[PDB]
Amino acid sequence: MSIIEFWLEAKATIDRLIEQFLNSNRDWDLVDISSYILKDGKRFRGTLNMFFTVALGGDIKDSYGGALAIEILHSASLALDDIVDLDATRRGDKAAWVVYGNRKVIFITNYLIPTALRIIQTSYGDDALNTSIELEKDTSVGALRDMYDNSDYIRTIELKTGSLFKLSTVLSAYASKHYNTKQQMLDVGKYLGIIYQVIDDFVDYKTKKVEEIDGSAKQLFKYYREGKLEEYVRSVYLEYKQKYDELISNIPFQSKYLSEIRSLPEFLANGLLKEA
């Protein structure tokens, strides 16, 4: 529908923001490496942010700020993910570390983060910041579990992947001047995030070798080995699709995008399955 269209523009607008930010940097040294970690992304979380802000009654103008902080955090987490799982093929190209090394990439990351935070509070306020720092710590926990404490699959993928979704959605609540839907929008992101990561893992089993499945996806092996994976995944997706279809009824979204938000997961899910 219009959703994909919006995404094409949002994505395009988002890249513009990265330039208006990168080129505009007193630090004419951190620009090269960053440009690398930051490029070629589909900017999915940022457009969802931009989407909800509009669907809430705000002006996209008010999203440009968080939408950028988000992809900077998302991109940053991706380059680290490669360092951790030892992948050299991020964005269908040589991973960051595989070029500047393990240090540079990391250091840049330890800089992109606090920058992202400033950007958020600078345009939303301290409450926004603190919420961001709370989600940021969740991600840091999730990442550890995603690697070692692989147990309680749902709680783990909520923490590693769902967190930045919640950031993406919750920010639309500040951005749209509807802070009243805060707690509610934190959940939208939870359900969308979970839904996103459960399918992403499902696509790992179907397009990757089992011996090549890292992360919390491993915990799903107990379903896959028995040929009941699709069954488990499907169930999950439905569970959190219903919680989602419900939550949206108690959330004051503009009628115009009502019938477009219902398919957000439906859209988001397939978007991954296309790689098959």
Add this chain to the structure above:
Amino acid sequence: MSIIEFWLEAKATIDRLIEQFLNSNRDWDLVDISSYILKDGKRFRGTLNMFFTVALGGDIKDSYGGALAIEILHSASLALDDIVDLDATRRGDKAAWVVYGNRKVIFITNYLIPTALRIIQTSYGDDALNTSIELEKDTSVGALRDMYDNSDYIRTIELKTGSLFKLSTVLSAYASKHYNTKQQMLDVGKYLGIIYQVIDDFVDYKTKKVEEIDGSAKQLFKYYREGKLEEYVRSVYLEYKQKYDELISNIPFQSKYLSEIRSLPEFLANGLLKEA
């Protein structure tokens, strides 16, 4: 009372603080968290903060939280120095203890940072947060430049080791509820910091092989050859030493904790010169 005395009481207390903290983080023993925190047990940076607190009339306990944040923030950065990147011509697919080390650091690092920030915000409010977030970005930049950026020793020894001391002092203001000393104390730390780092390098040449000094040595050479070996180390000292008293004289401090404050830059010089 006496400087030498206080340190041995704030340090032991900081150790109990870390002890009760680490206990509340057994979950992170997976990446041997206590290994990176219990590293540098001198707790110098945290002692200063705890010091100025009473020096300004603030309660000793109202600094506790701030002390911890600092040390944790310090450990977090120290840990960064254990990162190892797979060298050229010699690596190994699936052959590494180096991947565990890297993972450990990346994980534990991204957790310490936001964790400390929250301690700062929970104890001193958002005023201290935005500053901390800001001082963090600097400590971050202070590393990409510690590598190779052709930057002068000036805009590097300030960012690298400076940002932390600045945080120590400034938080001592929030602890003593003396807001006016905000921008004030911020500088009284930048000076104790530049010292602590410029002196550490002195120990890198007199206690370590000149061929084994990476970091500040990028520019530290034009002196040891001309003649400013032990000369230049003093040029900046007396400069930033008097510039320290030059400002400490005009800062609302108490009586008992006044002269001692003056004769303090030595501690962070002598205690780090007790090598050879």
